[PDB]
């Protein structure tokens, strides 16, 4: 029964097919559009920071991978609309698990997850 040798056909045939490997790093493969890459703090079109420093992103993080501290948007120095902005914002990427709960939490879309990894 040649069936018992079917495997030899599989490997041999795959020899003559073009390898399916993605060419990272020179030609990196396409990540999904929805991929949970690096967090990113976004700005409004006028340049103001979106992050109002509500700490909801940090609140929802299961790994405590976000540390945020808010500060007043004093008229002399305003960074975001409203009366609070995120003065200190740190993500400990050695604690981040890419779960994406932070961006789901953010009420201003200040925090997004880019496809960069």
């Amino acid at each position: 029964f040649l069936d018992a040798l079917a495997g030899f056909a599989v490997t041999l045939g795959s020899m003559f097919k073009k390898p399916i490997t993605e060419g990272y790093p020179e030609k990196p493969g396409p990540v999904a559009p929805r991929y949970h890459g690096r967090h990113q703090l976004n700005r409004y079109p006028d340049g103001l920071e979106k992050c109002i420093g509500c700490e909801l992103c940090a609140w929802a993080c299961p790994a405590d991978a976000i540390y945020v501290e808010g500060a007043d948007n004093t008229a002399d120095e305003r960074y975001s609309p409203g009366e609070r902005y995120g003065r200190v914002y740190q993500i400990n990427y050695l604690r981040c698990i890419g779960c994406g709960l932070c961006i789901e939490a953010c009420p201003t879309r200040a925090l997004t997850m880019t496809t960069e990894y």
């Binding site: 490997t21 990272y24 790093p25 990540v31 200190v88 050695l94 981040c96």
Partner: protein
Amino acid sequence: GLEERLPGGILLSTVETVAGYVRKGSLWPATFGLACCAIEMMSTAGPRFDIARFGMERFSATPRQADLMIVAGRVSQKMAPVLRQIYDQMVEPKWVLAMGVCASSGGMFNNYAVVQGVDHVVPVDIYLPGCPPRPEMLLHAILKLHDKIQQMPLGVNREEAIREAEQAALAVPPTIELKGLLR
């Protein structure tokens, strides 16, 4: 090693560069996957990617032939002695890649059972975020480690580099003291 007894100059520089080029290639990982990150190493070896393209296909089953210990997983308390034993039973030169957040810092599992970072038991050369890190991130970290290896000194240069790195590290303030802009 006689390569260390070689005096400085063009000879030692050429030995260093040749050794770095040789060791960045054929950087055989140890067959030491843990937790879910191990599945991502296997995927990195899988056809879609190809760890083999970097000469790293041979996952040395024995620590003796392994050059790189990709911890690649969460190290439980009971496992730390085993991981250290494996690291010791590898032979110089040795490098450790803390793949994943768990291996690097304990990740999401900040509790009794996890060691809170591989570096608690073995020197870590590269930290790799992700939970798990997608195979491209693993390859990126591996290439960063390749760059680190290429510049690795030898002999008298090794001693001088150790002394200089000591002098530099003695001065860096701890992360807890980087209070920039904190209220």
